[PDB]
């Protein structure tokens, strides 16, 4: 687009050791706008050779980056933070064009992403060691924290800026250097963040972005001896594989994988509050989010009222290009996601589910899918066991509390959940019984930089943001001082 | 008869509060490494029994984690008391099946008991957080919850401490545990389970499955209900177990190999370094993950250090662990003797001298002579491989940056030791050593209050200390909307 | 009372430097059973001289007591803990006879008191210091914790055992030594605990109990150069004085003073739960507790129903000697308390308050007072501005939320408060607005050893029990290591 | 002077509730340049009436200041931080003229003072509560932290900017409001900081500066019911009085009082390192610091060598006006300090001490004192028991380790101490035996914003800066939630 070429942050080259490079073979692959299908540019189709160069550059830069004081790195990171916020409109324009979400959501993500840079710039000055009461009066126990080393980050496409800073910021603040493999569907967001890193004074090699062959690059990131940690956000099948490859060198892991988030609305809940909350938890980013409400359980006594209000809100949605005014629902990332959504809806309907609205591709074509609502859904339908990653809201009837809790936990995942109830005992009892890493209690806007973000079970390991985020990128050194 | 007279000697496995044989009635013999005699047998269980233990642990998990932290602390402390009260009986079992001297066995029992007491107290202190809100309509309340069923696979070098170091923090966290101990030293694990039964630990909360390692380990690392694996052993096995745990994204705790370096600079307290290097090298006959594998000594004190060192080694009394004053027991098996002889032969063929020892001991069996090698350098295999034996390779060096590079020239990073009376050098070198634990003018670094673990391919996670219990917990972020 | 002479723990001499001593003047003051009026024994009437001997002994014992390891002190403190529980019946007997509370409550306090010994024996091993990320690469910042030194503890009569352990246990666990001045009304509990310390192997001088002249003993405790901290629990006027005397040497302070605890019952509260909870908060220890509900605010829409059910429960109480079976309300500590209770009720009645039940001395005479309930109370009555410290429940009517919150905070105190409401927003809103250090939310049984016990404003400073209790007795040492 | 009339930060009026006011009586007191004696200007001589207005203004502004989010206050405080640094040269100019220290030191203090604003702006976002494991499965223990309320700060003259931020920054970041009474010798530094607070958008009443009658203003700060915490830095006798006045209302206390800092140089020390460190510890701010080396103990085996080198460095000092190039020693704050310094030198000389250099007023007159060095000092001299607060270095001979430690601790104070030794055992043994809150170990530049600054014994209570500085301005609230 001409609107892309007018920004200094639109880069069609990779970023390795402070240089803007093409692949050694000069090959390139195209990037497309999911709302129009047109090609917006190309990126280098790099592979193992270039990925190794990045690791080597990150390792060399590691020695002098960790030697700086915490305040040295904090000042640089804050300059990075300032640049990200000053270029909010331009970063959002890139995101909407290559990823498809509305411009308002893209700007929100930019601010959400920038807050992690500021947060961890401050954490770096506060990663405290310990002094442990000795069991032997001739020894003193002094515990310190040190960076793991070179970090490998593999990021997805649904949040093409926040998933970068959520991994790069804590890594850098910890004294680590990072090599990044971004999704080929949304690479320009990562490269734009790297361009601002250059302007912020982040030395060469501390942050590297390698685009192209995912398997070849990922293979090097998960095997190279100098990569000490792998942080990955994406599907669970890919997570199983990456962790498998990391086994040969015992690499530290940080995984944020799939999520089948249940949203439970009891009959004693604030009905209007639960509806607006469920609307937000379901249709944000067109439902293409790991913490999106994949199952909405509603009690029998309010099922009819809830469904009617819920459908009324869904029918107000404006679907179209993310650059249009007032647009709320963008297109799905690719055709496979459309096919997955149509299958799960067809399966549900074949088992008695009704379509309250939507249920087919949108008139705009491309990968646009109609915002949909299903009623009469039960546990025998595949849409209860699989992630939709689309704007499809299955409303599941229930009555007994012990039964809905069992259904909510009847999944390999355990990322985010949501409970709506004005009864204090029920609210706490259910939140504690839910086997999830995050539980919204009469709230669904749970995302921010100060709370520990992550899941349990097969939703992954580790936490991003919060006081717990920085320790993920550090190791413990126990000094036994003999006096 | 010495162990038949012990109520703690058990030749059956422990699953869901029952003393079971294998479904096939198959058993495997256990031998005394100092004499060669067969002590008894243990069930040779497989995948079926391993699955029964996982199921039993999951059923017991619901009511075990429902108790209060103080309820569990009381039960754990009764377990702690019984362990210390049966120190002599436990040490007798360990020495007979493992080989180490009776004095070392008693020390491990107390060391091991301290973990039960430590984590009984930690269970009452798994603090959550209240985080300052970014939105005045919400409150951020963070809590900690048990991961669930834990699978523990333990080695033979510390057959009791490696059990409590994993089972104690798991139980204190509200978890239940299934344990696969080493077939060379199973009776120590079964004796600890018999005490657990006497301490009132409910059925299924702790289970010990003996026999086929590959079959039992395959179930532990794949069964959907097992949420965490904690393993201590060789790195190649750790790689395999981590790989198998990948299909269900299991949480990991790994304590693997360790090629521990010990550096003695010329400004060190010479006598203090010698006594420290002796302790770090010859404890448990050198069969320890944190044992001094490489002993770097500066050129200006190399000769003096080697002389004093050899003098101490030649005082060692080698023999049966039950004899008075015995300090060096036998190696665990014949493979260890062959490895040690191969590594010494390679070093000698490249210029190394044998200051003492260097061959099997006159007592036969798996006894190996306490040995000291001089003129060792980095081209020898003994510097790149773990000996797990009473062999001390003394390596000469001069430059500080060079010995630091040699110390880090390894895939491991468990324990390291530095001796120097210069404050700035002691801190500079310790901070440059890529290890999870660094002894600074000290080598007796083991205890229950310090975080025990390594970096790089020496593994992940920590045992003991304030950090040991969070390994068995998950974080729950509650966003309360007002 | 020969039941006292038959226990090894009944001691009529003070405890200083491991010896059982009388006053240098051989002067004694009698102790009485408040339920019967009999003399049960005497205690030494010591003054400044003996108090100075205890401080000197504590300072000498401090050198070797703080040199031990945390595990060494833990073993000794746990032996002390074991002995306290093993002698629960004997300690409860002594308390009931000299203090008056029922034998069941006394046994509860002994177990409550014992838990502090166990808790802080464990805390002593965990007074972690810090390693702070340096701002100058040539220095390292290592923070450690050290005992403050000799501690002075002045305790009241309402909880004559728990108040001792709540101060002596953390002091000893921190590496400190303690000199104790217990209330002359209930000294045998303090001396009994000291006799068990001797049996537990606590070295001589580590714990000392000085009985007699409060002004003379307290003057030494608050001025001797070697006393580095004062921990006091009692009346606010005395607290002001002790703190003032502590000024000349800048002594560290721990004060738990008065508390005009309010208990608010909104109309959306579980009525039955609030009644039982308010009954417990008011009549425990016959109302003679710092956290007892002094003001019971009840909303207009449930005032009549709450009052009726509350009075029904109060009329079931059995009043009498604490040793009898099923006794729930004992006698007040002394005649002054009966006077003050009667005066406050008379003032309230003269301004429109009605006596629903009680309102005069009990038929048993002595210092027994009838469990009473007042209705139609308002803020103009003195019973709302003064602690009654007795079994009298003033039920105050309110309607507006902002007003009842203003009334609850309209006091110089800020120790404990209680709020009953099934509305989540109201419960948090009010609890956060109440200027108190402790707020029970749909609960009144708030006392235990793991939670931080203390107040704000003129209710005092510092906390007892919990992770925060041991730091009170430690100082910080910042080591700046230059490399 | 006209150089002050040319900066917008030179204010000759007080700052109360966002207004620039004169005293109700219009009375004024003069401020003088100690280097020239000239009158620089006047400040309002306010009293109790105006101090009460400030408290009322701080209490009113408190309600809305604490209702903001931690990030809200962080943004405002960081704007304040940016302004302080942007106006470094102007702030340093004011300090050098009214306080006397060299312009280079003043600029250093500005940066030092600014770092506390940044540090606590970040701490405000990290004042974490707790969730304690329950002892009763029907309750949940949620611990939160709340601001103590209006804070009263009384600051000295030796660091007329850093002492302001070291108290106002954590107070504001905690959600508190502050009223400040600065030293009449250096008021313009405090008012200039207030002018920058106004520009930074800090609302009216959140920060107030009352100048004039110290006792009258201090009496209101230490007695008004709404002042909940006093933080004071100054002389121990004044601290004793302020604490005594705070007793009537049980106000929370933070005190940083006197400090008879010993510096011990053993014979196994890096001689040159110990000399340069002793020079820095002694003559920074012309020796007018609470942590300045008041006693310099030097082992007998290196006493002659240490002295010769020490006097060599002292004789290189350039004494003169703080605005002149290369000046390193400025004038003392007033004439009383010159007299006290001469008295302590006379007493030492009368008991055998030798003057190696200096020992009298400087040729420049005014309050300039010659940088002096005394040898042959011993414990019987007054200079060893009294703070000299001047450029006078008493070198004290010693031999035995146990003796020099006993001499170091033979004081009521316990603020800062320094030890130089290349023996690891001795360095740790001695540092652990020194009853001080801060110990430099082969280092004397111990001051920075991330380390806990404070003393033990009669040197005061509490800590400033570091992870421990913010809790001093918070209270703990224990919520016992009943399910």
Author numbering:
A (entry chain A), C (entry chain B), D (entry chain D): 1 to 483
B (entry chain C): 2 to 483
Give excerpts from the publication:
Using recombinantly purified enzymes, enantiomer-specific formation of D-malate by the NAD(P)+-dependent malic semialdehyde dehydrogenase (MSA-DH) is demonstrated. Based on these findings, it was concluded that A. baumannii MSA-DH catalyzes the stereospecific formation of D-malate which might be further metabolized as part of the degradation pathway.
The biological unit is composed of two obligate dimers (e.g., AB and CD colored brown/blue and green/pink) which are arranged to generate a tetramer with almost perfect D2 symmetry. Every monomer possesses two funel-like invaginations which were proposed as potential entry sites for the MSA substrate and the cofactor NAD(P)+, respectively. Starting from opposite sides, both channels meet in a region where the two highly conserved amino acids Cys290 and Glu256 are localised. Accordingly, a relaxed NAD(P)+ cofactor specificity was expected on the basis of the solved MSA-DH structure. The obtained active site model was further substantiated as amino acid residues Arg166, Arg284 and Ser447 were located at an appropriate distance for hydrogen bonding interaction with the carboxylate group of the substrate. The solved crystal structure places the active site loop in a conformation which closely resembles the reduced `active state` of human succinic semialdehyde dehydrogenase.
